Structure formats: structure tokens, C-alpha cells
Amino acid sequence: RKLRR
Amino acid sequence: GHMFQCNVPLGMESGRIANEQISASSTYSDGRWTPQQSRLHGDDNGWTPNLDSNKEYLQVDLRFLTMLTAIATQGAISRETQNGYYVKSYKLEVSTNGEDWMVYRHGKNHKVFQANNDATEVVLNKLHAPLLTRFVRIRPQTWHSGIALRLELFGCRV
Known part of the structure; x- marks a missing residue:
């Protein structure tokens, strides 16, 4: 689920 | 009394530097690291390019x-x-x-x-002599983990 910055 | 010294903050953090005068070569695609978030002591991330490299830059137009x-x-x-x-x-x-x-x-x-x-x-880094300019670019060369930037410029207007 989209590794967040 | 104190006389004037050319070393006052020019607008980041303050506000005198409008959102429109700040830009970058690129920005992270999720939209959470825009150039407008590079103001010194900002509490919402900072500026991050779209790709971490020494060709990206943050730009301020005085x-x-x-x-x-x-x-x-x-x-x-x-x-x-x-x-x-x-x-x-x-x-x-x-x-x-x-x-x-x-x-x-x-x-x-x-x-x-x-x-x-x-x-x-x-x-804080001082220039070895005050420079008369209108545009400034910060182009990272090395970084920890990734490029992220908050910024302030110091000087005076002529």
C-alpha cells in the first residue's frame, strides 16, 4: 500500500 | 543605538517570501514535499525532488x-x-x-x-562576500537517506 516517504 | 546590519532574514519562515516565489526542478510525486514546504522551521515535511540526485534544485526568486x-x-x-x-x-x-x-x-x-x-x-553558512542577486538555487550534492530541505536566506534589499 505505497511505502510512504 | 544599533545601526543597520545586512543580515536579516529575507522571507522564508516569515512570509514576506510568497509561495509563488519558491519553486524547484521537480518535487516528490505524492505531493507532500512541495517547494512551498521548504520554509525554515516548517512543521510539514520540507522540499523533496522527484528523484534524489545532484541535478535537482530548490529555487527562490527574490x-x-x-x-x-x-x-x-x-x-x-x-x-x-x-x-x-x-x-x-x-x-x-x-x-x-x-x-x-x-x-x-x-x-x-x-x-x-x-x-x-x-x-x-x-x-548557517556565510558567503565570503555579500552577493547582489535576485534568484538563488540550492543544488544538493550529498544527503542522508534522501534530499529534504528547509531554508532561509539572509541579507538586505538595496
Whole structure:
């Protein structure tokens, strides 16, 4: 689920 | 009484520097690291390019000819992940007209500015002589984890 910055 | 000194903050953090005068070569695609978030002591991440490399830059347009004496920088803690980012060194580019750009030099070679060792503290760098400019670019050369930038410029307007 989209590794967040 | 105190006389005037050319070393006042020019607008980042303050507000005198409008959102429209700040831009970048690119920005992270999720939209959470825009150039408008590079204001010193901002509490919403900072600026991050679309790709981490030494060709990206943050740009500020002072809109007028301005004496530029020093640059302060921080990294940023990710609001989303509590991860810290910071630029460890950068070059400086300046321009009066926005099209002819001079890379700041110390002697025959580009001045490489040493920057931050963490994501929270301010590192201030002075220029060896005040420079009269209107455009400023910060182009990172090294960084920890990824490029993230908050910024302040110091000087006076003529």
C-alpha cells in the first residue's frame, strides 16, 4: 500500500 | 543605538517570501514535499525532488535585486513515517535575470557548502562576500537517506 516517504 | 546590519532574514519562515516565489526542478510525486514546504522551521515535511540526485534544485526568486550574505538549511522529519532526511552538502547558483546562472565559486572551483548532520538543527553558512542577486538555487550534492530541505536566506534589499 505505497511505502510512504 | 544599533545601526543597520545586512543580515536579516529575507522571507522564508516569515512570509514576506510568497509561495509563488519558491519553486524547484521537480518535487516528490505524492505531493507532500512541495517547494512551498521548504520554509525554515516548517512543521510539514520540507522540499523533496522527484528523484534524489545532484541535478535537482530548490529555487527562490527574490523579485528584486538583493544583498545576499548567508544561507541557513535544515533537513526534515517525515510527518508520515517519522523518518529523517537532510542535505549534507550543496552548491549555490545565483542569477539576476533568471536565465544567466553562475555557480558560486570560492577560488577557481565551485564552493561546496557543508550543510546538515541531522534533520532538526539549523546550519548557517556565510558567503565570503555579500552577493547582489535576485534568484538563488540550492543544488544538493550529498544527503542522508534522501534530499529534504528547509531554508532561509539572509541579507538586505538595496
